[PDB]
């Protein structure tokens, strides 16, 4: 799967610096060669920030205590309960027909509260998080045969490593985020978390609060007062939302978590690499014959908004895979934005596509072989 | 009116590798042309997002049903209606006086409740889009003559093109959008000029009207066009606040407009970055002389871009081809230069050239191409009214 | 504290065209030299935004101005005040108990109204700022000896400069933000009254502060309720209470915020870097290369601290032979053979004039910190939107 360094992808100076470009998408790898010196792979290994900010939680199931009254009769003044000006309560106040039947002097509307503390239930929470683009690591590595490690963050971009034989290489990092981190937010649950977007989270009819607050706000919306009787009041529990939230993040791409590490599952990095006094190997691939090619992989959904695919090529390796893509009805505007840096077909394999297309109708090409493809198009959610 | 390739812009390396280095604003081309080879035009065609994601809905004008009352004595338990437990529908409770007058037997409050369903009048939606920066589209076009495509996204940033002549190229593209698309909503209005606004996130948030996503059936903070009146015995009035949307075209007046084409959401500034790889062949270089900082005048003054910038056009009298000497002041600080160009650069040429934009810092400022000046008021920011 | 381009930092080519990278953080500088010429200090020299746009003003405490109250008997219908239907006014509508004692024929409940005028007292805003990414200016500088200027944006990258000895050297900087805009807010209170007074805030924090609220240029507030109160009526009367000046809550919750550095008009950004292409024609650039620095002649001249926006920073002192580059890595408790620090500083080195000045960012958690072989713990707080 690794890919080898090309010609143009590489200059070499006058005064024996070379510089090398390498483009490392996330689970892409380059193998780079310098002559009289063993082989090394370099890749982009993995992309995350570890426990990001907590925004909001969202309670899916109001855990109401028993409900406090207070009534009055049509003379005594109006009614109160301790628990209105508390936190974690939800109350009502209204007035009540009061008479002989329930022990008033006169007959007519009496003051009446009805109060409840609202909490949520255990294991009820919907908690939203959100990255800090600068927090964001990205870690290459760099190792023999076609062991070191590099970590990059938009902030920290520049660095220098001992690869033994090599010397000293400078590694200067331009890290890039697949996802547009502004608009997202990781729901979680206590598939337990997801990726939503930020203006769908923010909407969610639902009470919320801050972690460390203990009270929430908007209780209301999932506890609701009834009509009073004289000197009683129902309360009613909207019940657990849970339900309708699992329903509504059905086909959304999953977040992936691991242990404290919230991982995006696409991005890249491109390098500009800078060694001494060496001589790079290099190498250009030759176009694929475009007619040796057979799905391996079938176009799919990549679970993380762009397509994926693997092809297996029966012609002389190794080549460069000639991909590309038109919009049902356009045959001649390519359309295919692929996120594989170098799509080849290696000795050892290869083969794999990944690419970002136009909503609507496409047709695939890779080589002859074709393939429709249907992008649905951008929404923030159910 | 495309620039030519500059020396300093690309480097020969030892083993026949020649890297080029491009920047391409949207509406800029470069025209790069190899020894005994034909001249290629590279260009940034154009900045776009397909369809972008639908947020919320703003009801400009409401649309109620019927009123639905329901009252009781002072001594019939509370009035209620069904509505009072259906979507789509606001309510009021109170207590009304009631008498003999009224059908009766004591005199004192009575129960009463007011709903009605409120909905969206027809073609009277706002709705706001918001942009995925990972999914806006960088044409860039390669062309002969002083034709391929390419684009480009935030995470698609290599390809290999066949330019024939020049062979198989490198393109490495680091896309830059010209707005900060977090802060950034379209708003858009229905269809049956202008129909579309590029707005600021916070002031589409806190636009005081009922919401709800596509998809919902009913709306959200209804009341805020739907008011109750004070009850009467056996009625309660229900009010309609009226079509909001005069009030909101006020509010976008001077605010730059979306540029919607089909299922297109063009971006009016932006740029690539690329650097180009090519093999075995002969970079034929230049290097513009400065012009002569006395023989211009104003083609077309500074003025309003139409996405915070200025642009304006100068015509040259004297010997073309040349760099255009351009800076910029803020009044009071004459050794400053404040003038941050968008265009990569500026030249005259022979088939044409001598367009300029450029960013300012608010305030007043005086523009200098050579020695032809001209005053110019940059406006703060703001996210509107 | 300036450091000497390196060779692997730049290309000579075929032609005579040199292309130079530099990585220029704010503060930062690199001092490049040619053959026959004078040595050029080149640096970010500052990152800012001249006035950012007003987004949502908070009244932290209300000027209530007197309270109108309307009552009627239990039989004259309800009661009615002309507030009820204003802007700027917080209004409460109820029941109260009526009889012979308060001027009414008959005995029960009568309806009842307050309404108070709501506005913000003077000097109590606190009002929040949004940075345009695209606005944000990135000033480099250049200038002789071991004096010319060039601001850079997101959207202005290229620019030609003339340094005399050096001739037409082009510039392509790409810029760089240090703070993730798009979720960040300048959370300011009227200056002139403690001149910190403004803050660098989560967007999300500022969003959810409960506080009356409007936008600039409108005349009254929104949700002014949340500093008003109303009390239980008695027969004829409603009183009203201030929730009073929330100013001491907001500032205890700001308690460790990073602040925001204003200058003038300037709203200045403390970290972020710009990182440039620099085209040179004709002239031949001096090389250097550093030598790591003894491994065991190092000491803290400043611990490892807070930069007061999101990193680490420290100072060491060298006593061996100098210049060279030093030997930083850190690690995360228990995991010896990861390193885990991400340094700010493109290339931490001893010089003779100075240097010794490293920033960092590192994982939350435990982490120990290695320059050289001299070390130190660092403990690093996790991610937060605020209190």
Not at 125 to 141: P, Q
Not at 206 to 235: C, I, S, T, Y
Not at 276 to 295: A, H, I, S, V
Not at 306 to 315: A, D, I, L, R, W
């Amino acid at each position: 799967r690794c890919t080898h360094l090309e010609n143009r992808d590489f200059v070499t100076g006058t005064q024996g610096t070379t510089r090398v470009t390498l483009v490392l998408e996330l689970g892409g790898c380059v193998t780079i060669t310098a002559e009289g010196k063993p082989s090394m792979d370099v890749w982009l290994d993995a992309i995350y920030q570890e426990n990001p900010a907590k925004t909001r939680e969202y309670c899916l199931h109001a855990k109401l205590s028993d409900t406090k009254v207070a009534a009055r009769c049509p003379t005594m003044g109006p009614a109160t309960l301790a628990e209105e000006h508390q936190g974690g309560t939800v109350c009502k106040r209204d007035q009540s027909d009061r008479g002989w039947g329930n022990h008033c002097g006169l007959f007519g509307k009496g003051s009446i509260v009805a109060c409840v503390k609202a909490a949520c239930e255990a294991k009820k929470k919907a908690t939203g998080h959100v990255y800090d683009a600068n927090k964001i690591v990205y870690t290459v590595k760099v190792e023999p045969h076609t062991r070191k490690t590099a970590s990059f963050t938009i902030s920290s971009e520049k660095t220098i490593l001992t690869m033994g034989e090599y010397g000293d290489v400078s590694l200067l990092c331009r890290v890039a985020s697949g996802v547009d981190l502004a608009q997202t937010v990781i729901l979680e649950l206590d598939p337990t978390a997801w990726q939503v977007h930020r203006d769908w989270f923010n909407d969610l009819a639902l009470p919320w609060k801050h972690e460390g607050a203990q009270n929430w706000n908007n209780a209301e919306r999932l506890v609701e007062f009834g009509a009073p009787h004289a000197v009683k009041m129902d309360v009613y529990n909207l019940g657990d939302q849970t339900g309708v939230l699992l329903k509504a993040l059905a086909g959304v791409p999953v977040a992936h978590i691991e242990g404290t590490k919230y991982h995006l599952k696409s991005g890249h990095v491109t390098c500009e690499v800078g060694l001494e006094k060496l001589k790079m190997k290099g190498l250009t691939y030759t176009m694929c014959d475009k007619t040796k090619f057979t799905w391996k992989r079938a176009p799919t959904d990549s679970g993380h908004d762009t397509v994926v695919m693997e092809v297996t090529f029966s012609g002389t390796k190794p080549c460069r895979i000639p991909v590309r893509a038109v919009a049902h009805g356009s045959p001649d505007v390519n359309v295919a934005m692929l996120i594989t840096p170098n799509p080849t077909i290696e000795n050892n394999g290869g083969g794999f596509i990944e690419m970002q297309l136009p909503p609507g109708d496409n047709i695939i090409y890779v080589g002859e072989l074709s393939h429709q493809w249907f992008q649905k198009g951008s929404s923030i959610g159910r």
